[PDB]
Amino acid sequence: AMAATATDKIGRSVPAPGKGILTTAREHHSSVKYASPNLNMKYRKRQL
Amino acid sequence: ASLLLHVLVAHKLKKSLDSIPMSKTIKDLVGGKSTVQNEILGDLGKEF
Numbered sequence A: 001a002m003a004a005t006a007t008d009k010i011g012r013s014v015p016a017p018g019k020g021i022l023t024t025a026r027e028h029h030s031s032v033k034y035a036s037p038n039l040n041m042k043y044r045k046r047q048l
Numbered sequence B: 001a002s003l004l005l006h007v008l009v010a011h012k013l014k015k016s017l018d019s020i021p022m023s024k025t026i027k028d029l030v031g032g033k034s035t036v037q038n039e040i041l042g043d044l045g046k047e048f
């Protein structure tokens, strides 16, 4: 379903593990009061 | 113990005695290189 890679940030320890892969869950919550047709499969289907 | 510690930490970072000031910490002198911090702490435990 998904496959992703991420680097982390400025650093000086090559073997230290980091949180770049957190980015796979990135999404924008500034405007979120009403549900989004794009997430609703019935809508997507109707459009197809 | 100040000559012995200065020399062991200086020789590990591969720098002359004047390059390493005694006022600075092991974490400071090492930068982010925690691989080298673990070696200095292992060497100080072996020594004293």
Ligand SMILES: *P(=O)(O)OCC(C)(C)[C@@H](O)C(=O)NCCC(=O)NCCS
Pocket (backbone or CB within 6 Å): A013, A015, A016, A017, B033, B034, B035, B038
């Ligand atoms: P520093 O704070 O980066 O410490 C060096 C370390 C080698 C002891 C540390 O970074 C470490 O535990 N590295 C291995 C992390 C790990 O298991 N990542 C997955 C593949 S080994």
